[PDB]
Each structure stands twice: as C-alpha cells, then as structure tokens.
Amino acid sequence: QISVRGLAGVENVTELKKNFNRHLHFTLVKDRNVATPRDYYFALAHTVRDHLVGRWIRTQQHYYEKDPKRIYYLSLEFYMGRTLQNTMVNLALENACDEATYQLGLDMEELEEIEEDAGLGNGGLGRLAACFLDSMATLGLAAYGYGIRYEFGIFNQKICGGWQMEEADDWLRYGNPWEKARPEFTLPVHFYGRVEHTSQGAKWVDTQVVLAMPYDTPVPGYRNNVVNTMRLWSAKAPNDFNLGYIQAVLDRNLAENISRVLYPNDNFFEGKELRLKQEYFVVAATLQDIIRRFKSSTNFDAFPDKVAIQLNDTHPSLAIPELMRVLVDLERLDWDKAWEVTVKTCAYTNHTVLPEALERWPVHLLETLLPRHLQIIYEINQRFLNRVAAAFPGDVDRLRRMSLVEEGAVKRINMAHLCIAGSHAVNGVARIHSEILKKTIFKDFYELEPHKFQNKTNGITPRRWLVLCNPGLAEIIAERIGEEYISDLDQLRKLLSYVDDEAFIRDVAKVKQENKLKFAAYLEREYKVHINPNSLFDVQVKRIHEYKRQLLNCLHVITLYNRIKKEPNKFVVPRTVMIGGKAAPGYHMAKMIIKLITAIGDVVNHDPVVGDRLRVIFLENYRVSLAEKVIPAADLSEQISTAGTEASGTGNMKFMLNGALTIGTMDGANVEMAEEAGEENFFIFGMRVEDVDRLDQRGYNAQEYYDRIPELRQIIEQLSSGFFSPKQPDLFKDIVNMLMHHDRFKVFADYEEYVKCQERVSALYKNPREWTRMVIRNIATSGKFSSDRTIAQYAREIWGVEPSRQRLPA
Amino acid sequence: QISVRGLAGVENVTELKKNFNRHLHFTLVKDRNVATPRDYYFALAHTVRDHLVGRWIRTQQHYYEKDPKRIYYLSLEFYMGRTLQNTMVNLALENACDEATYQLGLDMEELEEIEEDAGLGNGGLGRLAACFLDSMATLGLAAYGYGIRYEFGIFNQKICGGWQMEEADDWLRYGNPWEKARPEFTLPVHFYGRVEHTSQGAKWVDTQVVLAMPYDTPVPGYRNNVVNTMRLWSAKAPNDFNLGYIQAVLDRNLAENISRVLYPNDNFFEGKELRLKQEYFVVAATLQDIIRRFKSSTNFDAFPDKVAIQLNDTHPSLAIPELMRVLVDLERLDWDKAWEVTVKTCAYTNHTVLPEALERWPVHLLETLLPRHLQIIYEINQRFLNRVAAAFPGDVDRLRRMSLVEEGAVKRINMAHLCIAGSHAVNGVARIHSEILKKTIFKDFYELEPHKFQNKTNGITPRRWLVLCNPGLAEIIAERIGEEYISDLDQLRKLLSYVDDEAFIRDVAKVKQENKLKFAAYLEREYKVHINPNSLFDVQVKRIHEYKRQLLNCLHVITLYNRIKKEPNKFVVPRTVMIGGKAAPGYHMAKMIIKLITAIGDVVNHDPVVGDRLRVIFLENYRVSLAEKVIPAADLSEQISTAGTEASGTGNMKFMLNGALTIGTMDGANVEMAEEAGEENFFIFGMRVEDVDRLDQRGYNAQEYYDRIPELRQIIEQLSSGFFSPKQPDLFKDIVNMLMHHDRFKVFADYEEYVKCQERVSALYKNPREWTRMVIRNIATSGKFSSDRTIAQYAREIWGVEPSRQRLPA
Ligand SMILES: OC[C@H]1CN(CCCc2ccccc2)C[C@@H](O)[C@@H]1O
Ligand SMILES: OC[C@H]1CN(CCCc2ccccc2)C[C@@H](O)[C@@H]1O
C-alpha cells in the first residue's frame, strides 16, 4: 500500500504464502478449519523468523572471521515490546507479508495485536536498552545484549474502582517464537561459601551452584542484513540439588526463583537479597561467556582491545570485582595488571541523581552471599583512597566522601562509587544531567579524574518510533525527501523548506487527525470510553512518580473544570486529557495519585455543564504496545518534572518525532530539544535548576502559594472537603498533607506559570495552520534524538569502534 | 540392511536428507560446522515428527466424522521410553532414515542413544500403559491416554560405594520434540473450599483454582496410518494467584508443584496430600475434556455408548465421585440416572493384592481438600450398603467388611471398594491373580456381583519388545514366516515346524551370541566392566522389593561361590549374574539389598580362584532404554517372586519373546507362560500358592531351614560375621534378622528347590543344541502375551468396541 513498507513481488508473496501454510500444518499442527487468529499469528511469526536465521548465522560467522572488538551491553532490563512488525520493517518484508496474508483472507494488523509485549523492563531505562540494541545492529557493531530472561515481566495493570491492581505478566504462556534456548552453553554460577587462603592465592570454596541457561533472541539491523544477539540467562538448579527425595526436588524452586520475576519498582532501590542474586547471576554468567569467546579468538593485555563492557546503571556493577576475581584468582594475573585491564574494559552510565535510586548494599549481605567479592571491593577501596590521599593531601573529609564503603548504623557499599573507580568512562544521559553530576554528586570524582566524565544524550530508534507506529507520517515525509532519513534522521532538517508548503501542512494535519480517529476508535472498541476526536489530545504517559509531577497536571485539569463551572457559556478549547502509567506496587503515594486522576474523571466526565469540552481519562496498563498507539495521536506532550530531576526522558523525544508540541520545564533532554527546535517552538515554563536551588536555600513554603493564589486555594479546599470523594471525604488527606507540608518537588511553585503557559497552548490550537507549522518545525529538528546518533557517540568516544552502514551479503 | 525395517527408496531418501538439513538450519539455527551429535539427533527427530502430523490431523478428523465410541485410559504413569526408533518402526521409515543419515555421514544408532527416556513411570504399571497405547493405535481404536506431564520423571540411579544415590531426571532440559503444548485448551481445577446447600442442590464454593494445561504427544499405530493422542496435564497458577507483590509471584510454585515430580515408590501407598492433589488434578481436567468432546458430537443416556473410562489402578478412582458431581451438581441429573451412567462408563483394573499398595485415604484429607467429593462418597457407600443388606440380610460383618468407609483410629476411604462399587467391570492382570481376587480380598464383592469380575492377562507390544530391540531375531523369523506376525503374534506358532531345522537352530543361537557380544561391549564402553560373553547370562531386572526376592538370587550366587571355593578345580558352567532395578528412596531394606548385591560382587569378582567362572554385576539405572539392551542378551530370566504375590509381571514376557529361558515360581503370568510353552520347557520350582497358605496356617519358622540346610547355615554365618563387609562386620545384621525372624516372603522355604532347579539349568546350558531347541519352543508359544491380544479382549469384553487392522488413507 505505502512506499516505506517495501516491495510486494510475485515470487516473494507466493513463497511467504506456502511457508505460512507449512508452519500452520507442521509447526502448529492445525488446519484452516480449526485454526484461531492466535494460530495465524504464530504461523506468520514462524514464517518471518525463518528469514532471520540465515542472516543470523552468517552475521555470527562474519564476527568469528573478522574478529572485531565486541561490545557487551549489560542490563537487568530490556523492554522489547512486540517483535513481529519490527522484524518485518527491518527486513523490508511488511508489504509482502501484508499481501500474502490478504490473499490468505487474513488481516495482518489483527494478527499483530495478538502478540504479547516482551515486558522485561519498567520504563525509560529498559526501553533505552531496547532502542540501543536496534541502533547497534543498524550501525553494524558486533554487539551483544546480556540480561535475565524473567519468567514474569512488568505486571499487567488493572484499574478497579479507581485503584491499581497488579496481575502477573505470564508472557511465555503461549510460547516465544523469537527465542532459541541454548542449553548446551549452560554455565555455573556460585553463591555463598567462604574464602580460603593458600600458598598460591585465595580460593572461594563450599559454594552453592546455580546453573545459568542462555536463550538467544535475534536483533535485526535496519535493512543491512546484520542480525545481532540478545542473550538472556535463565536460572536452573543442578541435578544433584539438595540430593526427603520429594522435598529436595520441590526445593529446586529456591534456586530457580532468581530468574522468576522483574522487580517492578522502576529501580527505586530496595536492598533485597533476591535482587542482589539477580545482579550477580547476570554478571557471573555473562563474564564467563565473554572470556570464553575471547579465548576462542593467556595474554589479557589485548582483552580491552577486543572487549568493551557497558554497565547500564549500577545494577551490573559487580562485573568490576567479578572481572578482578577471575583475572586474579583464576587466571593468576597480578593485581595491578588485572586492574588496568578491568578499567580499560568497563564503562558506566548513570541514569539519575535522585538518592532513592542509588544502590547502597549492606556489607552483611555481601559478606554472606559474595564473601570473595567483598574482600576485592575492600582492596579496590583502599588503593583508590590512597590515590585520593596523594592527590589531595590532608583532605580527610574528601576521603570519607569518596569511599566506596559508607560507615554508619549499617555499613554499606556505594555501587556508584565502585563503578566510577573501576571504569574508564562515566556518562550522564543528557547535557544538563551530565553537568549536574560533575557539579554535585560526583564532584569529588570529577576533580580527581576529569577525563572520565562524558555526556551521551539519550535517543530513540526511528524505526519503532516513527516508521512502525506512524506509517502515515513516515510516508508523507518519504514523498518529499526519500527514505534515507530512516537510518539518517538528521535528514528531517530538509523538511524546514516545506514549512510554508500548503500541501504539506494539510498532509501533516491530516495524518494527525487520522491517528486521533484511530485511537478514539481503539478506546471504544477495547475500553468502551467515548472521546471527542476534535479536542486537543493532552497526554502525559510515563511511570507514576512524584518527581514527574502528575499532580501538577491534576491541578491544571481541576483549574479548567472550575473555570468552566464559573463561566459555563464562555468558549474554551476542548481537551481530552489522558494520563497513564504504572505505579510501583508498594508505593502508596503513587497509587493515591492514580486514584485521584480517576476520581477527577468521575466528576468531570459526568458533569452536563462541561459536555464534551473536557474529558479526563486514565490510560490503563501503559506499556510499549500502548505507547505506539497513543504517541502518534497526541497533540500536546506533558514533560513537567521539577527542573533537575528527570535525567533525560525519552518519551519526550517520541512525542517530538510524532507531531506533538511539548509543554515542559527546562529539565533533562527538554533543554536540548528546545535548543534544536528553537525556544519559540516549545512551551517552556517554570523554575530552572538555579531557581530550584534558590528556593531550597531560602526554604520552600507551600503555604505562601496557597495564601496568594485563590484558584489554588479553591482546589485544595475541594480536595480536603471531599468534593472528589463524597462517600470518603478524607480520602485525599495524605495528598493534601504532602502538598502543603513535605513536597520535595515544589508542585505549587510552578503552578501559576504552568496554567499561564497552558493558556498559550490553547490559543495556538485555535489556529490550526500555525499549530501545524510549529509541529513541522519540531519534527524537522528532531534528528539529534535518534539512538543512531547516541550509539555512534558511544562507539567513537567510549568503545573505540567505528560504526558502519555497509550491508552484509544477503 | 534388513527386511523388517522397510524400504529405502530413492525419492524418500532424497526428501529425508533435505528436510534434515532444513531443520538443522531453520529449526536448530545451526550449520554443519558447529553442530554436535545432539543437534543431529534433534534434526532427525524433527524430520520424523513431520511425517506424523499429517496422519495425526486426519486421524483426529476421522474420529470427528465417524463419531466412534471413545476410550479414555486414565493413568498417573506412562513409561514411554524413547520415541524416535519406535516412530520410525511404526511408519516404516527406519531403513530410509538409516540410508539418509549414512549419506550425510552420520551413524543413526549413535543419534538414537542421545534421546532421553520419557520416564514418567516406576516400572510394570507405567510400562503396561505405554504398551497399551501402542496396541490401541495398532488396533484402530479411538483411544486417548490421559495423565500428568511430570517435570521430573523417575530419578536417575547412581551407585556410590555400593549405595543407591538419587538424582533428578531433568528430562525436559533440552526440550521434547514429540509434544505439542495446547495452552488454548487449558481447563480450571478446583481445590479446598466448602459446600453450600441451596433450594436447587449443592454448590462447591470458595475454591482455590489451579489451571490444567494440556500437552499432546502422538501415538502411531503399526503401519496403519492411525495416530492417537496421549494428553498430559501440566499445572499452572492463574494470573491473579495470590493477587507483597514479589512473594505472591514466587508463591505460584505452590500451585505448580502438583505436576512437578513423579512419586518414585512404585506405588507403595504413601498418604501424602500432594499425591492426592495429583490424583484429583488428572481426574478433574480429564473429565471436563471428556464431557466437552462428548457435547461437541443434555441427553446423557448415550454417554456410556460414546465413552469408556478405564481406571488404571485406584489412582484415578476419584473419577467416580467427580463424574457424579458433574452430572448431579452441574448437569442436574437425578442421582439414580447419574449413577447408572457412571457405572456403565467406568471400569477398574486391579494391579496387586499386596496391602502396602492399597490406597486408603484419611477422611480428614478429603474433608479439607475435596469436601463435596467426600459427601458423594458417603452417599455412594450408604446406597451400596443398603444393597448389600438386602442381598445378605442380617450379615452385619459383611456390611463392615464391604464398606467404603473404614472405621478405626483414623477413618479412611478404601479406594478399591469405591472402584468396584462404581464400575461395571473389575479385572485382574493374570488368571491366577484374578482368581485370588475372587477368592480372597474381593470375595464379598464377587458374591454380590459375580458378573463384574473378569481377567485380562497382561501383555507387551511386539514392536518395541522384539522388532525395535532385537532386529536380528525379528529378521531370522521374518525369513521363514514373513512379516505378518508383528501385528499378529500368534503366527510365531509356525516356528514350531523349525525346531528340528539345523539352519534355524544355528541362526537363533547366532542372534543370541551377537546380542551378548554387543551388550558385553556396551558394559565396557559406558561402565568399564569386563564380562565373559561365553558365560550364561543370568539376569534379574525389575524394581527392588522383598516380594520379588532378589535375596533368594543372592543366596544362590553365594552358594555357587562357596561351592567353587570348596572344589576349585572342578568344572562349573560359567555364569554372569546380572541384577538391576531401582529402590524407592525411603525403602531402607531395598537399599540394603542393593548394597548386598554390590558387596557380593566385591568379593566374588576379585577372587583369583573363581577366575571368569562367576561374575556378579549390579546393573545401574535400570530403565526402558536399558531393558531394550539387556533383555535381548539374556539366557536366563529370573522370575522368582513368592507364589501369590506378583500379580502378573511383564518383564517375564519380554524375556520369553527374546530367546531366554525362564526360571520361576508358579506366580502371576509365569503360570500361563508355562502352560503355553509346556512345563517341560520351563524351569518351574518352589511352593505353589496352596503350599504358601499351608505354611502360613502352620506358622513359618525360618530357623527350621537354617538348622537343616548346612549350605544355607554357612551363608547366614558369612553374612552375620562380616565376610562380605570386613570393615563393617555388622552391616547386614538387618537383612539376617529379617530373614531369620520376620520374612513375609519365605526366602528360605524355596531355597533348596531353587538351587536344585538352577543345577538343571546349568546342565541344559552344557548342551547348546538342546538349550536352543527349548528356546525355539518358548519364542514360538509367546504369542498370547502380545498386548494386541490383551487390548482386543478389553475392547470386546469391557469397552464394547471392535478392533480393526484396516489402514487409514496415507
Ligand atoms: O536513561 C533512561 C532513563 C532513566 N530514568 C531513570 C529513573 C530512575 C528513578 C527511579 C525511581 C525514582 C527515581 C529515579 C530517568 C530518565 O530521565 C531517563 O530517560
Ligand atoms: O499390571 C502391571 C504390573 C503391576 N504391578 C504392581 C506392583 C504394585 C506394588 C508396588 C509396591 C509394593 C507391592 C506392590 C504388579 C505386576 O505383577 C504387574 O505386571
């Protein structure tokens, strides 16, 4: 149907059809008379999968022949989403499969909806890893993603009476056609035990063994015939485990629980033993695999020339002492040489400055679980502090500030300090974030080793986040500038010469309207909710946290409702306000905010005076597949975190690429986004980082704003008195109390400027032509935010490898 | 190479080769340069599997069209063994695959050794179910095997210092190519809860739900294009199970433990809750599946015309009250009609008279786990006893003897009594066993309902147990009488006219010698043990239990050793004595017997005076795959249980078919075997059932035999004093004590006649021509013991269906 989706040739369509029928018969053991849509999905998935394996085998053979430097990306999360459409896109198979399935009497889009998300992540961090894998393959890097194959990914969110309910994400129930189990490459992982010292070095003995079984998933590059590997470990008990008999077999679960479930806390730090086990499990198995592959190319001098290890946050920080353990205890390298190799091999990406996310493990846990690793950490610390002492003689407080060991009630290990010490490069994820790191939390380390500190502004893959989810926009763009931009997103700048083009303006607005209509229909078909598709689609989708200030959005929504109730017969730009995102199950306040949003909906959506001028919808079960639906339909992107808190954001970039305007604070990547588009083309409001600092030094008093802003006072009075909860008048007392007395994120401080800025949004929306022209200026300058750019920078500035757009032979 | 293995045509060989290469590339994601033998096995398995599915789909379509009466065989065990060779044999693909793999530069027999046994059974009962499935498909019956897909089958047995060690049988580690998961037909199973009574009947409420997920495995008939289904249930927790969050997900294991592990006790009764859960789980899911299939053909009058349920032992006895529950509580049939349907549908096979195997469940377990079922059982009992009371007025002790409820310290339910009450047919598994049932343990029930009681003598499939494991013998037989006997084993009678044929005699003895050489080589290659292949292969392989009297064999072995030590320079027929079998992990005496066997080996195998005249080997990890190796190599089959204890035996039949002579008591099927061959062609010895009874009435005094048999006295003195355990002199005190004071199985009573009979064996073995002629007379009369005969009798006399040898279209 459309150009960007590839050719639908006669030979290819005929071949896909017969392979589809073959899989339905031989693979699924079905015939057309008993087959359900699910069976048809699987037949197609298997057909498309076959096209990957040829390329998969020769890519890995190619890496064996050419022996390039290998990139190992270690993450506890890979938020992959659905694989079918992505695979078709990257292999140029989408139109052919569309045709083949059409001729079989099937709708492909219907089949695509059957696939479960691979939900092996929480949000931003996990999705970044997934975008990164796509870009590394597209740029021809010999890269491997290493993680854990969780049996249960992020929970499915149900809303019951306005309250979040969790249910297990049993994503493997029907099987996963994309993975290949590799039980032959199973590796042992050691836990507990004790350390023995001998004539010739230390020995870790009396350990409990858990087996790590790998599952490989292919990662296709964009139309370059490169197929990389994501290897995920599954925990398996050894066959002599605990070997009454029956109980010993049943107790195998204790070992296998390691890979059972993803911690759903968006990596808020919870010092749980099971989480530490997960962290070591991925690290220990991965490093054995890395060394094995290296030896099959004694002299570890060349190790850093052939291996790069990227630590995604501090979660795999145990790679540093585990690499030391292997080189010193097993390979018998001396400490100094082993350390040199370790530092040159490892690099660390920091993802946030917020203290609640910082991993600080109690020493007593490491003592019991990983006794050899604790000894190595102590030695690293000692030698690191000796360097600090020599560089800044007599500076005793620097010594305690920089120590990897934190003293106090319970001694802890600061994993971020470990990572900086043991890595040759440390990067933040947006310019403002990387600057804050050097100025605040890692200032001491920057003073000692300034060369280590870098920035790598985050990005998103234009394959999934434009071509896949918004084919209509990808197509109208391709018509004017060709298809090259899909792997060279800087080419969207060429769209600036179409900002005064009346045909293009009409087409952009047309694509948006079609997306909005399609999403409005989806909401009715699957959730029975009615929305006006002519209203401004105002959307905030992201994990529920206080720093993201969903509550600030709530205050604006209520302001609009109160203003309508005051002057009902006055014209207001109609809005559909959509908010979605999961709360961590044990995060009481986050769950209360969800309830508040639904409670506002209950009042606003049923007021006859309001009509269809204002609607408030909580988007249930926000996840990658839903993101691909809601983002192309958005008009306004809410990016309103307190300045200095959102390290980067990536959702912001997704909205920019897809034709939404942004209302946001000068935080994270919002700053670079506004810089690229021009500030006149963004709706910036609120305190900057410097203003936040000034307020903290003076002392934040929320009562001041309440006293001086009558519209704000009314809302708080409404919340307190039970306007939004008639049967439970006191329901929101905790929210009000937090807002009034202990708000870390200064919601009231930005309220006035936010409401004012929102008025400016509504004014522009009244002028469709000028709205769309500003949209075009956003889309046209979104090029910097491709993960191809991000990964090219990692490659050249950290990993020391050259990206390549050159095809491998088909 | 050989005739019985089918054709190796040019088109078929070329097609197998390309499909082999296709699976290696697309399915295994490998190429020849990285592939291991395991990969080659899987490529072949997938290639052969493809040939099944076409036939599998049309068989099940055929059953849907013709709507025949369906046979449901319910068992907690199916001891399937390996599937690859069996599939090739039944599809006539063996020579073609042999050729195809040879041309690819691969040895097929090597690939066949890679397959794990499907070890979902303990021994005789599980293997019977597996032979039965093969025969039902071969005889064209619309039959379904229903069981549990255990994650862990029977443990692997390791011998360490003469002691049995157990390790988990992780049979699914590398995947199972034969099964097809059917998550779409997942069914809910209910546990716990309570019973509510309403205006319109009882309701079972507040239950915990466990999901039953089916896996289907194909069962090919012999060369008839019939492919039946074995459906095995896997336990799955529902997604809202227990829904802190992490713990709720981890606690899913509690529900899923139901299908985790096979109880390895050879069905010695252990009243464990988990076992009861397993029993209900298979029953509840199976019956829902049966009713579903029946409704997709209101009027349950025709239910018994379209459905037969065979209860394999009492393990699935809960089918009776579960069927009543469904018909009464859910379908709202009246009791009397529901009961009529239940009785006409169900039939029960008893497998033993030994009390330790009898299932008698504590009422308090059923009260908590299955409260509605207990109420139904009580009602069945009440109505049953009213019938007893009317038939035998005033016979109060009959009432208590026949009750399904046993009173005492703890009240129990007698599951065997439930089965007789609720079934239209009850059968034993050999003529002597079925007679004992009517005369002893079920005498009261036989008096009430004589028509219910039947015999169905067990059998074995001649496909697995001749053609597959002994191709050399199958071939020399086919040369004389053709191939028809493979599905018509009565034709072996034609071999009687070759008993004086010098060429045939030479060939039979040649096949045996080749088998013995092959097995002697196997023992060295895989276990580094040296045996003389010119010795008499004296073998006893079967589960270790006191009733099977492995100890009687041990006493003979020691007698031979003592006789050699007394007269070293006197000629004795050389023997290799092989004993193998697993002991239940908690069965102390069985484990001590294993240790004794190895301890005897330690003394006998290293005595220079003995030389290679006597060897004692314990065969490690006895299982189906090992049976297929050792049975064709055997000269003497030990079947020496105390008369009246071994209900049938099936190992005995396997040895008879494969050219071994039998030394045995008049027990189980041994009686019918001797009757078929003629007693002159069997080595029968020892007490008959009647002699055992006489001894019990008089009182068994083991001391009498010790006092009067000096050779026996010497052995006991040797055991007691530490001759076979120098470093632990008292090691065998428990064995001696049991033999002397509490031997339920009268080992000493049969000692003299056994030793004497063994002398007669050795005498015949000295005359190779006369040994072989007697062998020919055994093989020639083994026809009755085909499971095709057994199943034809079940079909006609219990299930009311006609077997068919007619082909389905290919
Ligand atoms: O780098 C990927 C994302 C990583 N996240 C990490 C969020 C960590 C966090 C989690 C809970 C509470 C506070 C902080 C921040 C975003 O700005 C980034 O875009
Ligand atoms: O019917 C299959 C077999 C069933 N077995 C059941 C053995 C049951 C048992 C298990 C432990 C202790 C005593 C008895 C007896 C054999 O004679 C039969 O051949």
Structure tokens at B648: 């049938």
Consult the annotation and say whether A295 binds a ligand.
yes
Beta strands, E only, A396-525: 405-406, 412-414, 425-428, 453-455
Q: Is B60 exposed, middle or buried (0-12, 13-18, 19+ CB in 10 A)?
A: middle
Residue reference for tokens 């590394």: A136
> What is the phi/psi pair of residue A683, to 5°?
-100, 80
Residue reference for tokens 């009075």: A717
Which residue's CA is minimally distant from atom 11 of ligand 1?
Answer: A268
In this complex, is the C-beta atom of B54 within 8 Å of any C-beta atom belonging to chain A? yes
Give dist(CA B523, CA B537) in Å, integer. 13
Consult the annotation and say whether B337 binds a ligand.
no
3-state secondary structure of B194: strand
Category of B52 on φ-ψ map: left (φ > 0), alpha (ψ -120 to 50) or beta: alpha
In this complex, is the C-beta atom of B173 within 8 Å of any C-beta atom belonging to chain A? yes
* Elucidation method: X-ray
Chain B residue numbers touching A155 (CB-CB < 8 A): 245
* H-only helix segments in B217-272: 245-250, 253-256
Residues contacting residue A168 through CB under 8 Å, at least 6 positions apart: A152, A155, A156, B237, B239, B240, B241, B243, B249, B252
Q: How far is the CA of B754 from the centre of ligand 2 (A)?
A: 23
Q: How far is the CA of B351 from the centre of ligand 2 (A)?
A: 6
C-alpha distance from A268 to closest chain B C-alpha (Å) = 15
Contact A181, A213 (CB under 8 A): yes
Please, where in chain A does CATH 3.40.50.2000 lie? 1-459+787-810, 460-786
Give dist(CA A160, CA A179) in Å, integer. 35
Chain A residue numbers touching B58 (CB-CB < 8 A): none
The verdict on a CB contact (< 8 Å) between B241 and A180 is no
3-state secondary structure of A766: coil
Chain A residue numbers touching B36 (CB-CB < 8 A): 184
Residues contacting residue B5 through CB under 8 Å, at least 6 positions apart: B89, B94, B95, B98, B471
H/E stretch holding B209 reads: strand B208-220
Give dist(CA B49, CA B93) in Å, integer. 11
Residues contacting residue B726 through CB under 8 Å, at least 6 positions apart: none
Chain gaps in chain B, named by the residue before each (C–N > 2.5 Å): 243, 297
Contact B652, B430 (CB under 8 A): no
Contact A275, A257 (CB under 8 A): no
The verdict on a CB contact (< 8 Å) between B245 and A166 is yes
Give dist(CA B745, CA B723) in Å, integer. 25
Residues contacting residue A214 through CB under 8 Å, at least 6 positions apart: A181, A182, A185, A186, A187, A231, A232, A233, A234, A285, A289
Give which of B367, B355, B285 is closest to B326, Cα–Cα.
B285
Chain A residue numbers touching B239 (CB-CB < 8 A): 156, 167-168, 170
Whole-angstrom distance between the N-terminal and C-terminal Cα of chain A? 25
Structure tokens at B23: 């699976």
Which one-letter DSSP state was computed for residue A428?
E
C-alpha distance from B211 to closest chain A C-alpha (Å) = 12
Structure tokens at B688: 């008959």
B188 alpha-carbon distance from chain centroid: 30
Give dist(CA A498, CA A410) in Å, integer. 62
Contact B392, B446 (CB under 8 A): no
Residues across chain B: 810
C-alpha distance from B178 to closest chain A C-alpha (Å) = 11
HSE of A773, CA atoms in CB hemisphere, 13 A:
11
Ligand number with the minimum distance to the CA of B644:
2
Q: Could you say which of A54, A152, A239 has the minimum Cβ distance to residue B168? A: A239
Q: Could you say which of A56, A168, A236 has the minimum Cβ distance to residue B29? A: A56
**A386: which strand partners?**
none
Contact A598, A619 (CB under 8 A): no
Give dist(CA A542, CA A178) in Å, integer. 27
Q: Could you say which of B53, B181, B245 has the minimum Cβ distance to residue A175? A: B181
For chain A, give the longest Cα–Cα distance.
90
Contact B235, A250 (CB under 8 A): no
3-state secondary structure of B332: coil
Q: Which of residues 255-274 of A touch B (CB under 8 A)?
A: 257, 260-261, 263-264, 272, 274
Give dist(CA A770, CA A500) in Å, integer. 10
In this complex, is the C-beta atom of B254 within 8 Å of any C-beta atom belonging to chain A? no
What sign results for the dihedral spanned by CA atoms A519, A523, A524, A526? Answer: positive
Please give the CATH architecture assigned to the domain spanning A460-786: 3-Layer(aba) Sandwich (3.40)
Q: Could you say which of B57, B156, B174 has the minimum Cβ distance to residue A31? A: B57
In this complex, is the C-beta atom of A438 within 8 Å of any C-beta atom belonging to chain B? no
Tell me what percent of chain A is helix, strand and coil, each rounded to the nearest 5. 55, 15, 30
> What is the phi/psi pair of residue B70, to 5°?
-100, 140
Which residue's CA is minimally distant from atom 2 of ligand 1?
Answer: A125
3-state secondary structure of B611: coil
Q: Which of residues 545-604 of A touch B (CB under 8 A)?
A: 585-586
3-state secondary structure of B364: helix
Residue of B nearest to A152 (CA): B249
H/E stretch holding A690 reads: helix A689-698
H/E stretch holding A538 reads: strand A536-541
* A429 Cβ below 6 A of ligand 1: yes
The verdict on a CB contact (< 8 Å) between A167 and B239 is yes
Q: Which amino acid is at B235?
A: A
H/E stretch holding B325 reads: helix B319-325
Resolution in units of Å: 2.1
Contact B363, B412 (CB under 8 A): yes
B639-to-A275, A492, B128, B258, B577 alpha-carbon distances in Å? 57, 85, 18, 36, 14
Chain gaps in chain A, named by the residue before each (C–N > 2.5 Å): 243, 297
HSE of B660, CA atoms in CB hemisphere, 13 A:
29
Residue of A nearest to B216 (CA): A29
Consult the annotation and say whether B720 binds a ligand.
no
**Ligand 2 shell residues, CB under 6 Å:** B 124-125, 128, 266-268, 351-352, 354, 356-357, 429, 458, 545, 646-650, 668
What number of other Cβ atoms are within 10 A of residue B484's Cβ? 12
Consult the annotation and say whether B296 binds a ligand.
yes
* A664 Cβ below 6 A of ligand 1: no
3-state secondary structure of A772: helix
A775-to-A257, A406, A463, B220 alpha-carbon distances in Å? 48, 50, 20, 65
Chain B residue numbers touching A65 (CB-CB < 8 A): none
Q: Which CATH class is domain A1-459+787-810?
A: alpha beta
Contact B360, B415 (CB under 8 A): yes
B274-to-A417, B212, B345 alpha-carbon distances in Å? 50, 16, 27
Structure tokens at B102: 């040879």
Contact B557, B575 (CB under 8 A): no
Beta strands, E only, B350-409: 360-362, 405-406
> What is the phi/psi pair of residue B177, to 5°?
-70, -20
Is A345 one of the annotated active-site residues of the chain?
no
Category of B457 on φ-ψ map: left (φ > 0), alpha (ψ -120 to 50) or beta: beta
The verdict on a CB contact (< 8 Å) between A250 and B261 is yes
B4-to-B81, B137, B461, B471 alpha-carbon distances in Å? 22, 20, 16, 8
* A328 Cβ below 6 A of ligand 1: no
Give dist(CA B557, CA B553) in Å, integer. 6
Structure tokens at A476: 């109208």
Give dist(CA A361, CA A288) in Å, integer. 24
Give dist(CA A395, CA B797) in Å, integer. 97
Residues across chain A: 810
Give dist(CA A227, CA A140) in Å, integer. 9
Ligand number with the minimum distance to the CA of A427:
1
Which residue's CA is minimally distant from atom 7 of ligand 1?
Answer: A352
Residue of B nearest to A38 (CA): B184
Give dist(CA A322, CA A373) in Å, integer. 7
Q: Which of A236, A315, A464, A542 is catalytic?
A: A542
* A546 Cβ below 6 A of ligand 1: no
Q: Is A21 exposed, middle or buried (0-12, 13-18, 19+ CB in 10 A)?
A: middle
Which one-letter DSSP state was computed for residue A786?
B
H/E stretch holding B436 reads: helix B431-439
Q: Could you say which of A166, A180, A243 has the minimum Cβ distance to residue B166? A: A243
The verdict on a CB contact (< 8 Å) between A249 and B260 is yes
Contact B258, B277 (CB under 8 A): yes
Structure tokens at A611: 């009509």
3-state secondary structure of B808: coil
